[PDB]
Design a binder for this molecule. Structure first.
Ligand SMILES: Cc1cc2nc3c(=O)[nH]c(=O)nc-3n(C[C@H](O)[C@H](O)[C@H](O)COP(=O)(O)OP(=O)(O)OC[C@H]3O[C@@H](n4cnc5c(N)ncnc54)[C@H](O)[C@@H]3O)c2cc1C
Ligand SMILES: Cc1cc2nc3c(=O)[nH]c(=O)nc-3n(C[C@H](O)[C@H](O)[C@H](O)COP(=O)(O)OP(=O)(O)OC[C@H]3O[C@@H](n4cnc5c(N)ncnc54)[C@H](O)[C@@H]3O)c2cc1C
Ligand SMILES: Cc1cc2nc3c(=O)[nH]c(=O)nc-3n(C[C@H](O)[C@H](O)[C@H](O)COP(=O)(O)OP(=O)(O)OC[C@H]3O[C@@H](n4cnc5c(N)ncnc54)[C@H](O)[C@@H]3O)c2cc1C
Ligand SMILES: Cc1ncc(C[n+]2csc(CCOP(=O)(O)OP(=O)(O)O)c2C)c(N)n1
Ligand SMILES: Cc1ncc(C[n+]2csc(CCOP(=O)(O)OP(=O)(O)O)c2C)c(N)n1
Ligand SMILES: Cc1ncc(C[n+]2csc(CCOP(=O)(O)OP(=O)(O)O)c2C)c(N)n1
Ligand SMILES: [Mg+2]
Ligand SMILES: [Mg+2]
Ligand SMILES: [Mg+2]
Ligand code: NA
Ligand code: NA
Lengths: 560, 572, 558
């Protein structure tokens, strides 16, 4: 028996469990549209307002669920609009299929070169009969390479009849010597760190147990926030840069670092990874164990005993408390000019235990990293390695489509919200009760801070005219609020919390131009800087009560 | 002696007369920003809210002035946001320079960026050395002009902050006359034709006078490509419009009837009854191109048309001439009947009449992509004093706003419109803020049908199942404008138009304004699928057609041919 | 009414005047082969032994005639073998069409990204009916961009019946600017005319203008022969096949006129392409017009000037240089060197001879020793500078000009790379005279390593390959000579074999370094006394004078 080549493509997608896909129709892709139309019962098509949002939401689908994301764009400008979302997925290593329209084989640009760089698989379908098989292979290449597969489909092909009976959709324990050699080196260290990334997703319980047992402080990569609960008193934050003070400071001091599902004064580097091509990378590393994170951590645990509090442990616990109190003093202001810190507190107050956070790119990464309180039941996404602005809105859309029953925030700077603002209309249209929080500083704040640090001449391109996002949201028929004072927060967030039981809501938070404390440029220690520099720093960042790790090392007898 | 490499880069730009440039800063491009900062008296940096608008605006600059446009974007996602503006430049064949940030040659997303631009660019290099950086920029610019396309330079951020010797760093063809025997052959074929057409594209942009003189002397009807609208004034009675699919009825119908077609600065973007193809073009690669071409002349359009003119004199009306004239009058009367409605549900047609009404004689129109191309092609009344831009060959939506920014920056003393559908306006809406920020008095008109109307009509013609992706929720663009602090109006009835457009006219003496026209889901008459030939299509289809398009009084070309004693393509 | 798509393709090629094309068949291109088979009397298919040679030969076709060269390769490995020839065509700016086989649309490497960088037009045909259109457009884009067009052809489409019946301006000179240019030129104290191949058609005028105004001539390497080499005021080329007199003169010049090209006060330039106007140094006067018309127009508004000291110093430098060159060429006995071999080539060369020249020391040596006139042609890989082009250049030369004498001058390194296609000259009866200069080195790279490297030589001295035995292998008459005295009889024999069949001479030469015109040790006011004498000894340069000697001798400073 026969079938339209288009209808078979859609069946290939359903066979792989694709629940929703994103795009904007064009004549060059209307035969795929026709097939999607017949299947609206079985697959959910989300019409976006800019195809980049579709490509970003697809990456975000795959970041959230591990399942391939699917987007499409019309020939020429529809497909090229996909680029920021497709690079995002290439660089964060998530599977995404993109379909691109193309004029019919009989019925004039060469599209294939356009996708050669971003895609791990990039083919133009030549024949209706193999069209479904090409889609099937694209999907398995995407999964195989954890990246982008691109298929360009000449528009006549999906309208051709083909046979149905012919197509298909084709849908270990660690080394016990090494584990001991690893444990021993870890045991002997004076300043041990356990430093994990998303490779340790399944291993949060073990990480926390090992940390408290052996009195060893924990730090994560930025995407690894929430794998171990933030409130855990020996969790230092992340290093590198949405960087938190305690992690940045301890790293300089450690003598042995255990890298768990990661790959970033240290004499020994210890490493656990599932992938051998990852065992060496940043500096000559001394013990590399090839194995699963959860198991190797359980194998360490099964052969160690509770040590008692060491100096290192106690200086770190003290630094963490001091940092946390600093953050709390920012959060706890009750009245006055609104700043990012209180908006994040108010977010914390309304957040449910399993909230999902879609985070844009800018000061929000730094601020969310420090103020959000996450646990293993939270999820948070962003564009990590490509770091494209604009992903807050699309990430929130995907989150809500995958998890209709969970609370979803979109946290975004105004520069980033502006880039994908139109797709606020997409939340209204598809009834996705996202809570959007726009941090309005009228600046590219992250880049102003960078220019402050490097440029000789005046600021340029980093301060701009205000956009009132509560009117933008009104424009797309979404309820919204604009606040500019701390004391407005409680009531506005309660309203948002309730509106989002049924419909999207936006809060436009007009915040000050205050720079968030920079963890790599501390001026806290009387040794390394002037008394006046320290006074200016403390004034600027309201950090009068913040102490350097210097202070706590000495309080416990350790050298700096 | 001694300058920073970044400062030398900006001096290159100034030397080539770059007045303004677009982009969004990032750490990977903060050293070029620093150098822009020092030169802010001599070059105007325009901060846009999405880098695609900067690249689209750059293409639009080059379209309007022939001067290279300049945009930039930070490493990674800033530069990739440029793609739609760059492909638009490439496909419309206008020079654009894009500068891409990259991390410094010291700490060097550690992406290889160079392969990203290999397909769009005619010149695509990573600067390796501070001292040759200015030469690289200068070569990039030369190559963009040479190829009339995109040049891309990736610039490691440490380089513009390096000192270099100031002591090291750093044209228009007048053409020969046409071959006279070849022009005579061409003139004789043209004169002998019973049904001749002159079909010109933007290659004929300097030849509007000759085109119109030749047309009236010899009683030969004119049609144009869509971009060539306005080279001859629309009001000229023998201008048939364009053929293709912003297509106008008279041009479309005449193509099928013609025995001889003269392509001038064109090369066809279908004829069947055409015995001879005549072509005048400046590029020998273009001579030929479709389905065998008969006489081909390598020369400038203006000189060649003046040569032809010099060797002919006035002919009397021909039946062909009077038939096309009558067909044009009938088409125009149909369009005016749509425009002249005074009350009722707003349609695009009355919106454009209201634009015509407030427009200055030298107004510039930035036009987006969708039903607006078809409608503005039919309703706008342009002359050689106007300019219009759109994305012609790449046909990317979103260019209305960026083009109007570029237009107002090049010509601050000229009235500038942005005509955009709601789908296209949505894609670059954030950059309404930029017209506000830079005080650019654009008149924005959004055509709100809550549809991808162009695509709906395509699904209507081809799809077996129900519409999908083509009807969507409203966005109120007057509130979007209020969001960015721009005065604005929403209108949904014909009778609201005069007063709203007059306030807009006046507001735009000082500041941007936006009008959000809520319009019906009516489908504009498809000039490519007429059902009027009381012979060629059932009596049922004809009645259905005339009713849907309010085309009760429209006659097919066949009627006017018959009136003047000429056969059709129904008689073979 | 109907035609096979493949036949239509071959008809497009014929319609465009394509006489011959090169390639190696495979199943992925067997339908185009089938169509070539049916047309053997209207288009000549040359089967090569390595596809790179077919691409390089295609490039040489276009350099010699200005008409598009055509090559093809089978899917995957046959097409990728083309690359050195496609890049040669891209960089030397000549139109070449390349057809690549591909698995059938219905019947799976993605081949299109392979050609993206080399090609100005790079398309997969998707449909039998438009195929002839695709080929025609490819040819037009190749000509338009003076570069490579690539078409991938699914092997099923050429076997499909399709309807048979559905298949530049030079600017002239702005006469104020020509007067302006003439003036700065005339005002000049140490003027030079520096031309490249853009002055192809203007050799007469360049020479008249030089004799009239007493201005010395310089060329780019590829412009050698545009003005007879005998002309006593031709200084040679500057850069790196460079000859001493041009090298020295340029450093002393105050005005330089650049004609069809791309201490100095003014840069004058004539060129046909606006993008070229100012491309090297900073220029005062730039003329956008045709090289020949412009030089004719300059000639009209000028009059016979008299001998000058700059004129006389250059003439005398040129005489000294040519006497040094002649002295190497005139050795009569002893260990053979390249100099005597080139002399021996000069002595049997006919006046309208074509030289295909490979890459290495040979470009330098032949630039100095060959005596060319406007009646000669010479081709090589100029900008890409790929080794191996000697053999395929000669094949293409003899195929375009069966009635003219054709030399292939190659080093051993470069001849090794395409040696297999000596079999192609035999097979197609193409009477090339091949001369292989055997130093058992990558001589040019050894010299560079001498200049730059701290450690010993590496990779630049290798074992001997006897090329007369190689030629004997593919059934071509050949000789090996290693002494100066052997040349006359061998070259006279070679000369006469080449009236009928290809022949090869394997000239075993010394490892002597040819004089480096950029590393001269001849100025006592500049180089050490032990240096200068060492230099002279090594290069047999005892009679050679720096230009400064001659500047002293006629009044001029530095
Ligand atoms: O993103 P990130 O920086 O957190 O992860 P990155 O630090 O960039 O990468 C995550 C690392 O974890 C490794 N990984 C993934 N799954 C496991 C696992 N089950 N056990 C151990 N390592 C793993 C990956 O190979 C990778 O090296
Ligand atoms: O369709 P379009 O108007 O964009 O023009 P196109 O038809 O895409 O391009 C215009 C054509 O006009 C030619 N052209 C440009 N300038 C001249 C001129 N001065 N005289 C003659 N032809 C010209 C170009 O070569 C091109 O073929
Ligand atoms: O290789 P080359 O260095 O000789 O030529 P190049 O100097 O590399 O290139 C040839 C130069 O001559 C120019 N040219 C080509 N034809 C003419 C002409 N008829 N008149 C003037 N300049 C021309 C080209 O535009 C180019 O700049
Ligand atoms: C598309 C894109 N352009 C530029 C950048 C470089 N960039 C990084 S952070 C940033 C500023 C973000 O500004 P905003 O969203 O307002 O956040 P803020 O720092 O002000 O909170 C920029 C422009 C990027 N990552 N993506
Ligand atoms: C970026 C992009 N995506 C898709 C297309 C295909 N396309 C052409 S017209 C059109 C619809 C335009 O709709 P709108 O702007 O609302 O104008 P309308 O036809 O409804 O007046 C689309 C989606 C395109 N050209 N560019
Ligand atoms: C395919 C290729 N590989 C390497 C080079 C670099 N190269 C330039 S000259 C040269 C030496 C050529 O040696 P040979 O043919 O023996 O000539 P010789 O200098 O010894 O006369 C080399 C290796 C090149 N141009 N092409
Ligand atoms: Mg901001
Ligand atoms: Mg619309
Ligand atoms: Mg050698
Ligand atoms: Na946008
Ligand atoms: Na070989």
């Amino acid at each position: 028996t026969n079938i339209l080549a288009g209808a078979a493509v859609i069946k290939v997608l359903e066979a792989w469990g694709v629940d929703h896909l994103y795009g904007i129709p064009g004549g060059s892709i209307n035969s795929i549209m026709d097939a999607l139309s017949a299947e609206r019962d079985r697959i959910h098509y989300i019409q976006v307002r800019h195809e980049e949002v579709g490509a970003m939401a697809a990456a975000a689908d795959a970041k959230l669920t591990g399942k391939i994301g699917v987007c499409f764009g019309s020939a020429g400008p529809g497909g090229t609009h996909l680029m920021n979302g497709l690079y995002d997925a290439r660089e964060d290593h998530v599977p995404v299929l993109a379909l691109i329209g193309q004029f019919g084989t009989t019925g004039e640009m060469n599209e294939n070169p356009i996708y050669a760089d971003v895609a791990d698989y990039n083919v133009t379908a030549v024949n209706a009969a193999t069209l479904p098989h090409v889609i099937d292979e694209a999907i398995r290449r995407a999964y195989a390479h954890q990246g982008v597969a691109v298929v360009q489909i000449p528009v006549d092909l999906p309208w051709q009849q083909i046979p149905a009976e012919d197509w298909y959709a084709s849908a270990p324990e660690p080394d016990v010597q090494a584990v001991t050699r690893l444990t021993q080196t870890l045991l002997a260290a004076e300043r041990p760190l356990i430093y994990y990334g998303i490779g340790a997703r399944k291993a949060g319980k073990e990480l926390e147990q090992l940390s408290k047992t052996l009195k060893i402080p924990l730090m994560s990569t930025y995407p690894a926030k929430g794998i171990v609960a933030d409130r855990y008193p020996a969790y230092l934050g992340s290093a590198n840069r949405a960087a938190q003070k305690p992690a940045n400071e301890a790293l300089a001091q450690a003598d042995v670092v255990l890298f768990v599902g990661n790959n970033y004064n240290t004499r020994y580097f210890l490493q656990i990874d599932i992938d051998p091509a990852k065992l060496g990378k940043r500096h000559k590393t001394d013990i590399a164990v090839l194995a699963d994170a959860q198991k190797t951590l359980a194998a360490i645990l099964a052969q160690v005993s509770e040590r008692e509090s060491t100096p290192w442990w106690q200086a770190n616990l003290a630094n963490v408390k001091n940092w946390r109190a600093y953050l709390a003093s920012l959060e706890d202001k009750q009245e006055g000019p609104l700043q990012a810190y209180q908006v994040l507190r108010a977010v914390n107050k309304i957040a449910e235990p399993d909230a999902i956070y879609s985070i844009d790119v800018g000061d929000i990464n730094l601020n969310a990293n420090r103020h959000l309180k996450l646990t293993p039941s939270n999820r948070h996404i962003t564009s990590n390695l490509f770091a494209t602005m604009g992903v807050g809105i699309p990430g929130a859309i995907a989150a809500k489509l995958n998890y209709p029953e969970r609370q979803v925030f979109n946290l975004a700077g105004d520069g980033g919200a502006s880039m994908t603002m139109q797709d606020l209309a997409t939340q209204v249209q598809y009834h996705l009760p996202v809570i959007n929080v726009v941090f309005t500083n009228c600046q590219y704040g992250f880049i102003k801070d960078e220019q402050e640090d490097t440029n000789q001449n005046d600021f340029i391109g980093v301060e701009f005219n205000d956009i009132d996002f509560s009117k933008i949201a009104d424009g797309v028929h979404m309820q919204a609020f604009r606040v500019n004072k701390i004391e407005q927060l409680p009531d506005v967030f309660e309203q948002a919390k309730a509106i989002a039981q049924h419909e999207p809501v936006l809060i436009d938070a007009v915040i000050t131009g205050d720079r968030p404390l920079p963890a790599e440029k501390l001026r806290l220690d009387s040794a390394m800087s002037s008394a006046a520099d320290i006074e200016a720093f403390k004034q600027r960042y309201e950090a009068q009560d913040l102490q350097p790790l210097s202070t706590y090392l000495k309080q416990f007898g350790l050298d700096d």
